[PDB]
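In practice, a research group might receive sequence data for several interacting partners and want a quick structural hypothesis before committing to experiments. The following worked case mirrors that situation: the sequences arrive first, and a predicted assembly follows.
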Amino acid sequence: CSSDSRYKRQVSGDEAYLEAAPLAELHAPAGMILPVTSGDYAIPVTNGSGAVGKALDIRPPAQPLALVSGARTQFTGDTASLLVENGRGNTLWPQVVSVLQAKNYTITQRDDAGQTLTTDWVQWNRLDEDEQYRGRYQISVKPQGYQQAVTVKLLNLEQAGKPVADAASMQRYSTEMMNVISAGLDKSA
Amino acid sequence: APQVVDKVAAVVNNGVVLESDVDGLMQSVKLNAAQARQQLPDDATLRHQIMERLIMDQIILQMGQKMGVKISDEQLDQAIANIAKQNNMTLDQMRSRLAYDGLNYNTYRNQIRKEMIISEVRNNEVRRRITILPQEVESLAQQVGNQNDASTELNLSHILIPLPENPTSDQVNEAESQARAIVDQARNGADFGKLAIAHSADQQALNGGQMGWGRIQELPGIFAQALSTAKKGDIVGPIRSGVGFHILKVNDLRGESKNISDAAQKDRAYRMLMNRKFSEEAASWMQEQRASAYVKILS
Amino acid sequence: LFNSEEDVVKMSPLPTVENQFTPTTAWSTSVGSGIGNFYSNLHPALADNVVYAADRAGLVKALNADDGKEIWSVSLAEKDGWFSKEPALLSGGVTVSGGHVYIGSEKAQVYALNTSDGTVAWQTKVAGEALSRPVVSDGLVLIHTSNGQLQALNEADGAVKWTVNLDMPSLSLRGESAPTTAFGAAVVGGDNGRVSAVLMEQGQMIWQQRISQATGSTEIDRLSDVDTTPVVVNGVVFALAYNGNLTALDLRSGQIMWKRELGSVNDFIVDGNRIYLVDQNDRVMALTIDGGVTLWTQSDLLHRLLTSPVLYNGNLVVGDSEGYLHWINVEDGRFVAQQKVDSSGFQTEPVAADGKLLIQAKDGTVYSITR
Amino acid sequence: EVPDNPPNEIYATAQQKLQDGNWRQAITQLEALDNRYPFGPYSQQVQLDLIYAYYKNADLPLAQAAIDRFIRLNPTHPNIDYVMYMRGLTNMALDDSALQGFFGVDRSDRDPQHARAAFSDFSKLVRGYPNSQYTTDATKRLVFLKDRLAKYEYSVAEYYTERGAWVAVVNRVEGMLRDYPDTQATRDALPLMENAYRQMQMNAQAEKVAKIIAANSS
Amino acid sequence: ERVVYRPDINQGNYLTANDVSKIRVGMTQQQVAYALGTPLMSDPFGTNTWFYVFRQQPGHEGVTQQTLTLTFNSSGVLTNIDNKPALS
Amino acid sequence: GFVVKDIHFEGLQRVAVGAALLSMPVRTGDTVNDEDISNTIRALFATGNFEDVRVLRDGDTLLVQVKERPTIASITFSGNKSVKDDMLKQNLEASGVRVGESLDRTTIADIEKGLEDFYYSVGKYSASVKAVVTPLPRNRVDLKLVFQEGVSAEIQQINIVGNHAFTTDELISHFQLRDEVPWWNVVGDRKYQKQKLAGDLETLRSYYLDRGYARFNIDSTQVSLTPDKKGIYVTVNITEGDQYKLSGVEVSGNLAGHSAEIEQLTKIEPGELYNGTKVTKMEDDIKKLLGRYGYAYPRVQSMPEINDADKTVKLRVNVDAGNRFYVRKIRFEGNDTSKDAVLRREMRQMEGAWLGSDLVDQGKERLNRLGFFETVDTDTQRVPGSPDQVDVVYKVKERNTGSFNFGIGYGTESGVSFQAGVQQDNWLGTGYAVGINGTKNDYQTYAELSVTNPYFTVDGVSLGGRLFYNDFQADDADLSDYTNKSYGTDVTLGFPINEYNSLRAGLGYVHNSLSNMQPQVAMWRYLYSMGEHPSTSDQDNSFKTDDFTFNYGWTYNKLDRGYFPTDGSRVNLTGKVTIPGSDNEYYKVTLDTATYVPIDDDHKWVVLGRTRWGYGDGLGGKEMPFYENFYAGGSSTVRGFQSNTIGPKAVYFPHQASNYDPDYDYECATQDGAKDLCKSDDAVGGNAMAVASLEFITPTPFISDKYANSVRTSFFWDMGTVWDTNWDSSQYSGYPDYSDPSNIRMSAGIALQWMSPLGPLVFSYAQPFKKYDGDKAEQFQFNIGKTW
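A structural hypothesis for the assembly, expressed as tokens:
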């Protein structure tokens, strides 16, 4: 019945495990040894730092859809690449440009010679977030073997007027821009 | 406007017939007709028979592929003797193939491979179907006596109106009417070769149904009793043998009183018995395969 | 539970015919309870103008052919009361030869009643249910039990002269093939689909040859039973298998001469240069003997479970599961006449001999048909 | 419930319903996509969203089945660490209860099967992918699960101390020392082992356990 | 004073005079395990010692215990046998 | 000979363009002829993914037009009635056809035949199958399989050849496969199943070996179909052999010192008939006896030495006990709610001790008798790499041990009203038995709490406590009407004395205070016995009593389960006696009994005999207080009667009520209209009570086994009587003799019990065919909670 906006992107638990007591070893007295450990329940010492408890976003990692005919689509750290097929050729760059013109995004740089462009800012009206993200993106098309391929990269992401560089957010809103591009290309076709 | 280069003309058991095959045999039969003086019918009636021959060829080729039968290069070398008619015209190169396909090598070599593979698998299956009985051999040999009785040699043209192995009476009367109409046309003055190209399920339809010169005893019997009473050019009405209705025309005949002087007659009688058995079992098995096989003509 | 949930509508309707003559029932006589709903081979036997009939429990009865009047009756159901009154489960059909009346039984018994009054001359235990029709020849009585064993009882005293084993599949059709006399041999069928020939002296197998295509996936598609009687003519054996081929074989060599996708479990007829047949679907057909070419076919009775045909007065006669007798012209499938004889169905083969046609209904009533 | 629109529109609706926060209709749409279009531009994405929605909807058995199928079909998938983390989460989730948690009941005495499975999955994740984004939370959850398992063993040993089965007590505490040496439950159990040794008049072993206690309780 | 039903608490592994008489010094661990069975209790604190305890508490009748301590060497060869047939 | 500038694909839906290009003989290069295009088309089709392939040329561009084999959108099995969709769906999936997979139209016939084959495996040989392919918009297809199930094949005969000792009818009477179905056996059928013929052959073999036939042999078996394939014939060819007698049984091998008992197990009467099942039972008994001593994995094999000449059989039994196994760990699985100790304290097998298996079974039955778990199973697993140790694992499925009762009475007509109650037997998996009850009205208040620890001491000593409060005074005391206010406490301690018997002792205190009672014969008789001398012509009176009692009890419990028992008997005796010092003195005792006797090996059909007795009386010149009286009737004691209606009825003296309403709604003895003693229908109960009941429990006909444990149906016959032993029959000769116990009420009907989420629910319809004047009938009754 009753619900809260944050039931999404949250762990289905009480977060009590963060209060568990730390593990400490036992000292072996002189003249004897402690029984040899099995090593079945050993916890490796990982020095990584990351979100814990409610601060960890468990939303599935947004993978590029690759709607327009293609394969070996990928999502890098801050950039995303989609490989296309079916004889697009140089005509890929016009279509890409037209697609991003259909979104009336604020394109700031337009270098047709290098098949590159850059926008100022776009916003996302997501019902999933308590605060709406926004990011600055650069898109390009480059030749690969037989055909051209599109790439979309994020300059930075911002929340509430301050920057954010979380890997999950970067991946999510690059798959967002990549899906936008792929859907536009498919619609054009 | 876009131009169609090739397409699938027929779908068979996991195979396809391409339009580059129908056209090839179309040109082949047209060239043979022109050299033989025998006029041939309209595009569609000729097309249906060519498509049927290609369905039967694709079925047999897939059976050969399934059964692990392959052909050697020396087999192609030997077929060059007769398939290319090098013995008749002394030249090896493909410049003799002036009619069509620009004197290409691979196309005609693959065509020959297609014929050798079909013939090989046909022969193997039909031979494995033959049953020979000593009693029949003795009977036929004792028939081969009294100055080689029935030494008549015949060149005949044959037309087959097919019926399924288990036909319905409706189909029976339909085939009966068709066969009687063809027989009436042939007897009234219609050229049997033209009738054969238009109306025939036999493999030899594309060649006009000519069986070539043979000896009467070689007939499966279904034709010899009726055929003993017939002159050059006569038309023989419909008959049956399991595969459908049969119609025969006596193209030519030649008889002589030669006698081979049993020690050497038993082997010859076995040869002719094997010839008749192969002809009948071949027709029966090719009809069975046609009924069984999956096919969907495409248009 | 529910009696209104299971039914398949695959029965042809009663054809309309203009009868060229008026079929008549010369006489009729009740013989016990009859075959009943069980599938059996029991049928009358005609011998010297005497009609011998039997019953599933056993009521062996002898009736006059002329007016169905009886001359002697007996019951083989626990005559001495060894255990209550158990049924004899007779299912061998009446055989008549040499003054003896041979009958099989599903209790693995073979009775050899007498002609003069019915006294049981001898009773022999056999390898199993004597489903086959006894065949009398060369002083021997051949039986083919349900467990796949051909036995040759001695005619005089019933002693088993010899025995032969035949392979039995995991599933088959109820019934067994009756051997044929041939020339000092015995040509028999089998549930495995292999026709066999055995010499009359002992069980030395002469030849065996497969008759069924049996290209199925599961057991029900491999039903290759040869439950018909092989017919020997001029040294060629005609055999017919269920879901198999109507084939002709050399009597001694055993190699097939020709084959045709036609199956049945009802005995066929070989007359002159023609073969009259009834397929498993109740399709009356006529072929030729030299080669299979279906001279004509009839389908008006399709899926009306028919009995085996009999040649009578120059025309073919067949009974049906509803008690209607149908006459068919030999030259063509046109019906020559039709009659209603009994309310209970006709299952077992009719008898046509000495210019007289007899049949027995499922209820045991023996009918004589004339004109 | 599910119309026959192309896969694009079904996926768009599923994404919209996931963003809104309704799991049941979103579950229906993703299941429709998975069953009707098992290949295409959307494949695997549907399965990841199905796992997420099953977890958030408390459909834990279905989440386990989906995770198993995804793991056995796409072992090389770059985001398989997320799948293993969700496996650990759904196994830990099966180890909890609502009413008992509401009443403040210590559940470490109940069945440890699900805790053991969660520990196995989280250990697999941490060892296989040290640099994953979920490794820190996985390590914290491992430390908690280890403490829970040691507490279960301590509960069993305490019961057998009450019953008077001294061999069982000694074996249980020895298993604790060999399996969970560094947990607090092991430190609490050592006195039970010493008492069990003394009740069987095995003074030499009680002396050794007392030496351990003196050398470490300080 | 304690008039309530208490089940028998059997603890350890069954010992018989014949089995205890089958083992002798110099026996390897495999032979001892074959003669007496796997011990339900060993020394986990750094010694090759096997404890064969035989407890029986039929109820309120009083507990009895026989404890057989087998001390092996580093090579697994039995070195000392100490049999106590009753509690102190 | 032309350069391919570009390759464009059309029609690809499932096959990625990359895969198709890899499947191509062309590499966007050049040097291409017509034959290359033909080979490309042939290769594309050879991949088996395309139904139609076409290649077109547009200038220097290659346009590849492909029609992918349509995709299955949905599969709908329509018309199937006997084969269920899931089964048939699994079979079709196994055949390689599933939603999404490309539909190779060259195999539809095949799958159709496969389906028919499955029907053949179901016993439907004359069944027809057809596939209808309906084209959809996105080049998908719905594959609807229409089924015409044929008439099932039935067995026309089962024949046995070679049987002379036993008639065919008797032999086949035990078979599952049946030739004839008795007219009264509407649920039977003549269907044939291969697994059943296999079991019937095993049944025949066992029958012949169990009646003395060591040489019995089944020569062969034949199964045949009728030409039309709607009848089935079965034949069994057998060889009886001859009857044999036992000469002796001699045991050999490693008996592990248990020769005396094993030899006592293998006892035969000299010259008895051979018996296979007896030999099997001897083997099993030897295995069980060895298991009692820890030999968990012995090998016991018996071989009969036959003597055909003498026709006698001598059994040689070889026994090898093996190693004595020890338990290493005892593990419990499935106790997600129950605390681990709750399960572990029921164990008779100690963890680190030698195995006996008898103890393991004892622990299993203890857990079953506990009633907290729906299913309990045991598994003794050998420890890997250990020749002498095992792990015992108990797998349990937990139940809903709680039950809830709720309702609302008059509503808001007079103030507010409601009724509530909860009862838990495993509160929060702690093993505690907790219970709260309450009711609120303008005419009554009631509260009751109960908490019991079944294991207050490890040995099983239980400690329990109970508080209760009850009131009838109206709010604000509008008028001096009948009032009854009581409260009290009760502390009880129980302890076991056997594996099945336990005793209970405790102390209770109860305070009662009645006032403004209506004068009636029984209550005034009791009050006179107490020494009180209340008036009879007016309703103003008062009475107060404090009571201390010693409570005792004894419970014997050997039931199969704690819920829906199928075997065993349970007896529970309770009683109380006032401690000297109470305002009134008496004793009371009650005795409940419930016996279950199974009739089927599966325990599906059971006979339940239930009984209840009660007697109480005063000690000195006093009498048992009328508020301790026994009551009968209702869903708990005698179904078909209104609750607490059986027994003596109140007799009122003429008197004036404290109120006089104009509705005439007052007892018959009201002074306004009456001046003589008159009876009523108000049940008052009696100090002696006896009730009995016989029930026949049957399987529920319209539920699958998945709910068998959840529903119980029974047919019951109940008897019950209540009487007042002190009723002065010498006086009051004009009224029924309430001291006579012969007035036995009876009822008969049908009852249904369901383990609903709110606990047990009991419905019953009972006709009370025997009743006496004043008894209120209630044919249909509904109840919540543990009944009796």
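Before designing any experiment, note the following. Chain C has one domain: 3-371. The interface with chain B takes residues 250, 253, 255-258, 260-261, 291-294, 296-297, 299 of chain C (CB under 8 Å).
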